[PDB]
Amino acid sequence: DKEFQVLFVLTILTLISGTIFYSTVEGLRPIDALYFSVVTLTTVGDGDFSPQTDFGKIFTILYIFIGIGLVFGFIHKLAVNVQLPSILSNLVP
Amino acid sequence: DKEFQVLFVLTILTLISGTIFYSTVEGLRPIDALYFSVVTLTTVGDGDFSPQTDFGKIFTILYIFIGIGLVFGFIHKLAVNVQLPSILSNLVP
Amino acid sequence: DKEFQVLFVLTILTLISGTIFYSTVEGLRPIDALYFSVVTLTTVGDGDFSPQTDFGKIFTILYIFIGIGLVFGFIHKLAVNVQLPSILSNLVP
Amino acid sequence: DKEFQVLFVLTILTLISGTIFYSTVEGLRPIDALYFSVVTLTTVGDGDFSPQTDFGKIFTILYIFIGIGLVFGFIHKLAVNVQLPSILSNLVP
Ligand SMILES: [K+]
Ligand SMILES: [K+]
Ligand SMILES: [K+]
């Protein structure tokens, strides 16, 4: 319960950092900087864009390292203790 | 047995939601909307396309979150209790 | 020991199927069809290309499902019981 | 403690090998070769570029195999025993 809330806020602040960086350093639109931030951390990736400034490239490097860990954690638990009991509850005869 | 069937139907409805959204909001061909839906959730990604409407971008965001969890689950078990005993059965002398 | 060899041959036959399909249906060069096959299953993805025939798109769909499971398994164990004792052996004082 | 340092240096040497290969064989700028090396191993991928020489393609193949294992290991533990106690320490009332 209080672990989803935590790993949620840490993901919010993580995504906030990226949206400000890319919307500032790389010149993306806020919504675009958010998307890029989301697709890189979940490792989906963006097919239409890549960081054009060496600054953006180095940030993205450290960003991926500090991020892939905590972003997927929220993906695991967002299901494990949230999406799961919700789907178990629909099965029960 | 009845867990593969479940995580299968939840993946069907998940993929259905995406195919309708992208084929409607982003204007992709049904088969294309399906592909995009599949490559984003398995995190492979699409190199030829990215959501062009801010609507599609936000949907994809929430879509990736609610999806990467249950899609890989079907990938894990589709093997664990299906692909595996099938390959163990071919080894037995 | 005999588990790396197995998950290795299953990955060989998996990669072989893809290289023939893409080099035939999509018209890629053998080496290119192999690369695409490798980057899609490890979920890295290809930024320069996507299946252009609906046949290639549907194959890739089923291909990703039957594949991401067994390809990463070889990635896990290729390290766990191969890359690891090799690196533990270099540490020992 | 001494396991983060290890999996860190193995990732440094891994990333070094790639940066030299791509900056030499594919003709990327050092910083670009590094980025590509990072995005392929974490499976994020690059949307703006793909290996253009068959040499680069085959290297990338073996590179992804020997790499995805040890790179994510550093991602797991970089959090587990580093990012985690750091975040647990901020919660304590
Ligand atoms: K990925
Ligand atoms: K990717
Ligand atoms: K592209």
Q: Do B43 and D43 touch (CB under 8 A)?
A: yes
Query: What distance in Å separates the CA atoms of residue D81 and residue D20, rounded to the nearest whole number?
Result: 31
Sign of CA dihedral A71, D15, D47, B46: negative
Method: X-ray
Do D56 and D36 meet the contact criterion of CB atoms below 8 Å apart?
no
Tell me which residues of chain B, numbers 14 to 33, contact chain C at a CB-CB cutoff of 8 Å. Answer: 31-32
- For residue D55, give how far its alpha carbon lies from the nearest alpha carbon of chain A (Å): 23
Query: Resolution limit in angstroms?
Result: 2.0
C70, HSE (Cβ side, Cα atoms, 13 Å) = 27
Please say whether the beta carbons of A35 and B60 come within 8 A: yes
Residue type at position D75: I
- In angstroms, the CA B42 to CA C75 distance is 17
| Chain C residues with beta carbon closer than 8 angstroms to that of B87 | 6, 10
Q: Where are the domains of chain D?
A: 1-93
C-alpha pair distances (Å), B31 with each of A48, A83, B59, B72: 20, 28, 19, 21
**Hey, what CATH topology would domain C1-93 get?**
Helix Hairpins (1.10.287)
Q: H helices of chain B, where?
A: 2-21, 30-41, 54-78, 84-91
